[PDB]
TrEMBL record:
Segment of the intact protein contained: 788 to 1132 of 2297
Organism domain of life: Eukaryota
Name of the protein in question: Acetyl-CoA carboxylase-like protein
Organism whose genome encodes this protein: Chaetomium thermophilum (strain DSM 1495 / CBS 144.50 / IMI 039719)
Length: 337
């Protein structure tokens, strides 16, 4: 059977969410939850996925309604794929609205186009905030899926499912909803372990209390409410979480290394010029915040340059004197007085 040129990451993303969701819903499809979750995080972290999702759906939607829109979308995708890495989700959202519901006369003869381009509109809205934002949105949905079902069981002294079923009688929609929620609660043991694994993966929230922290804050606070014996351990673990220039200087270091001076090719050997690195030593910023990793993991000359920058900025009130770099075993030996 034939396949799309770029649809392999899209085909593996869709199944991994489905496999985890089945455990949350209460479906019999059991699997090695650890391996699939690792695979799920890996696919959400690759930037090919937004393009892969678009390419899989758009291939069948090429010869759909007015091609004028279909062709302009393709040009933006192809340019952004090779040139750059981030998906043009924000640009693609703008062009869909401008043609579908907006261009009522030419583009949409009758109000039909909104339904046709709906999967595309769902894709550029999911990535509108960004790639890692998509990674955080889905994690939140899994946590929320767990809480939505479990909250009623942790509800106002109702420990009985049959009493809860007779309580569910209030809603007409509950006709099919009743059995679904009960099915999910029966397989809570597997559900708890999935959430625990999801919480363990996002446990290094200690440094990133901002971006991933605030994003997980609402779903986490609802989980802490689940005092019930079954969810008691997960509530404790959840609570643990709630309790919880670089480039600019690199260029200056490298510009002192090799001074262009048109006419000669080999300026690599030439020592770093004082005036070149004078800009940094006379600055006001806490230069020393980043510097600590530049005498590190760089060219032994760039490591030398970083050492010099440090001396001329750390002992400023002191007088300027001769600098000597020696090479023995370890490329480090600097000398000043």
């Amino acid at each position: 059977s034939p396949v799309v040129v770029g649809s392999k990451p899209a085909q593996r993303f869709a199944v991994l969410y489905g496999t985890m969701c089945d455990i949350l819903n209460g479906y019999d499809n059991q699997v090695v939850m650890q391996q699939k979750l690792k695979e799920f995080i890996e696919v959400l972290r690759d930037p090919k996925l937004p393009y892969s999702e678009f390419s899989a759906q758009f291939s069948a939607l090429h010869a759909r309604m007015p091609h004028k829109l279909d062709a302009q979308l393709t040009q933006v995708l192809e340019r952004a794929q090779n040139r750059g890495a981030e998906f043009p989700a924000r640009q693609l959202l703008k062009v869909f609205n401008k043609f579908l519901d907006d261009n009522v006369p030419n583009k949409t003869d009758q109000d039909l186009l909104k339904s046709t381009l709906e999967p595309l509109t769902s894709v550029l809205n999911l990535y509108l905030d960004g790639q890692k934002a998509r990674e955080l949105n889905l994690i939140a949905d899994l946590l929320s899926m767990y809480a939505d079902v479990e909250c009623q069981f942790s509800g106002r002294r109702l420990q009985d499912e049959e009493a809860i079923l007779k309580l569910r009688d209030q809603y007409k929609d509950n006709i099919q909803k009743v059995v679904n929620t009960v099915l999910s609660h029966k397989n809570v043991m597997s559900k708890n372990s999935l959430v625990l694994a999801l919480l363990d993966e996002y446990r290094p929230n200690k440094p990133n209390v901002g971006n991933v922290g605030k994003h997980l804050r609402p779903v986490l606070r609802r989980l802490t409410e689940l005092e019930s014996r079954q969810s008691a351990k997960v509530s404790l673990k959840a609570r643990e979480v709630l309790i919880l220039r670089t480039a600019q200087m690199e260029h200056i270091l490298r510009s002192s290394v090799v001074q262009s001076r048109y006419g000669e090719t080999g300026w690599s050997h030439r020592r770093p010029d004082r005036e070149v690195l004078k800009e940094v030593v006379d600055s006001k910023y806490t230069v020393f915040d980043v510097l600590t990793l530049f005498f590190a993991h760089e060219d032994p000359y760039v490591a030398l340059a970083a050492l010099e920058v440090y001396v001329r900025r750390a002992y400023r009130a002191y007088n300027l004197r001769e600098v000597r770099y020696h090479d023995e075993e370890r490329p480090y030996f600097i000398d000043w007085d």
